[PDB]
Design a protein around this ligand. Structure first.
Ligand SMILES: OC[C@H]1O[C@@H](O[C@H]2[C@H](O)[C@H](O)[C@H](O[C@H]3[C@H](O)[C@H](O)[C@H](O[C@H]4[C@H](O)[C@H](O)[C@H](O)O[C@@H]4CO)O[C@@H]3CO)O[C@@H]2CO)[C@@H](O)[C@@H](O)[C@@H]1O
Ligand SMILES: *[C@@H]1O[C@H](CO)[C@@H](O)[C@H](O)[C@H]1NC(C)=O
Ligand SMILES: *[C@@H]1O[C@H](CO)[C@@H](O)[C@H](O)[C@H]1NC(C)=O
Ligand SMILES: *[C@@H]1O[C@H](CO)[C@@H](O)[C@H](O)[C@H]1NC(C)=O
Ligand SMILES: *[C@@H]1O[C@H](CO)[C@@H](O)[C@H](O)[C@H]1NC(C)=O
Length: 309
């Protein structure tokens, strides 16, 4: 169903706010995403920095310039009939502080969603990879985001909710927040007036699930790492999307990736698709880059992504 790529770059140099366009961060290569769309890819997760989109205070107005760049890339993707997911890539933090005010987060999402409220090909993603946080707070922030999105009149779009502990699928039931609570203990009770919640988890295939190593543990490690989360989703009648995953260019990773995507296809009653990490124009020889012109992983995994589209 959903099959596509992350676009990463507009959130780079996150320590430099607002940062310098062309030095700290950049926006995306529409010629490259046009190739992906022409191939049949139908979703692009557009990563961005909260402090650049809504500077100084998360309840404030949106920066016209950075919003203007976001909107051009969103409209490029959606004018060509693909989904654009808007992802504040902030780990649950704003100017480095854990986001502790559900009211402020509701307001931030009301503001952002208001700019895209009539575009049904837009998807909202409450925040990338909350971590190191009270589990209850992460659930409460996801709920606040849903509230603000629908309060803006953005009623057609899926809302991607992300768990604590880097929203890892393999640790959904085991990783503990600051309050001792797991994602399984906190994220089930989310409600949406439009019933369009996607449980958005990430899954890497290396030893510690971080994706920093090119070595995938073994040929089945992806599917096996989704099994516990898939039971939680099936049992609690939720649906999900694999919003980041990757393997490097070697035979074990390629088999593990194939096997993961087959597992999601076999469990399509709960898994709606998968989004590769990552494309974007500033990755160079990054082992996971599928950017067409120079991504080391493009020629191996671009066909695999399309095979599950
Ligand atoms: O995944 C993308 C995202 O990953 C980030 O790195 C994470 C990584 O995802 C993963 O969550 C990893 O989790 C470890 C964790 O570090 C603990 O060490 C944990 O261990 C525990 C051990 O299993 C025992 O239970 C013991 O009793 O307690 C130990 C911890 O106290 O095991 C978890 C997985 O099993 O943590 C890293 C970050 O440290 C980032 O790389 C991020 O940038 C990336 O986007
Ligand atoms: C943008 O994508 C095109 C098409 O793949 C590529 O030829 C070009 O080099 C890319 N530009 C940048 C800055 O990466
Ligand atoms: C993108 O941002 C720059 C400032 O960094 C601004 O000059 C430009 O007009 C923006 N683009 C759009 C389409 O608004
Ligand atoms: C979810 O549970 C928490 C506390 O357990 C709280 O935010 C609220 O009571 C619940 N949310 C909804 C929408 O019921
Ligand atoms: C793959 O690795 C996981 C985690 O280390 C392990 O539990 C599992 O037994 C391994 N599978 C095979 C077939 O070796």
């Amino acid at each position: 169903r959903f099959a596509g790529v992350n676009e990463s770059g507009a959130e780079f140099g996150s320590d430099n706010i607002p940062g310098v366009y062309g030095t700290d961060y950049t926006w995306y290569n529409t010629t490259a995403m046009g190739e992906f769309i022409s191939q049949g890819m139908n979703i692009f997760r557009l990563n961005l920095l909260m402090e650049r989109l809504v500077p100084n205070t998360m309840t404030g107005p949106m920066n016209a310039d950075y919003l203007g760049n976001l909107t051009k890339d969103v409209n490029y993707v959606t004018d060509k009939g693909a989904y654009a997911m808007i992802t504040p890539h902030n780990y649950g933090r704003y100017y480095g502080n854990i986001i502790n005010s559900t009211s402020d987060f509701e307001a931030f999402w009301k503001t952002v969603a208001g700019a895209f409220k009539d575009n049904d090909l837009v998807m909202f993603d409450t925040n990338n990879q909350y971590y190191g946080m009270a589990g209850q707070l992460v659930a409460d922030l996801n709920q606040a985001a849903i509230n603000g999105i629908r309060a803006a009149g953005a009623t057609s779009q899926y809302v991607n909710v992300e768990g604590n502990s880097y929203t890892g699928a393999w640790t959904w039931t085991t990783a503990e927040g600051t309050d001792g609570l797991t994602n399984a203990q906190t994220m089930g009770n989310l409600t949406d007036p439009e019933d369009k919640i996607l449980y958005h988890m990430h899954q890497y295939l290396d030893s510690d699930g971080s994706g920093t190593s090119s070595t995938c543990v073994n040929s089945t490690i992806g599917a096996t790492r989704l099994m516990d989360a898939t039971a939680w989703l099936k049992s609690n009648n939720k649906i999900a999307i694999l919003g980041q995953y990757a393997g490097a260019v070697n035979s074990v990773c390629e088999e593990a990736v194939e096997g993961m995507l087959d597992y999601i296809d076999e469990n399509s009653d709960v898994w709606t698709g998968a989004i590769w990490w990552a494309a974007g124009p500033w990755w160079g020889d990054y082992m996971f880059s599928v950017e067409p012109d120079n991504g080391p992983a493009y020629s191996t995994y671009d066909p695999i992504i399309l095979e599950y589209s």
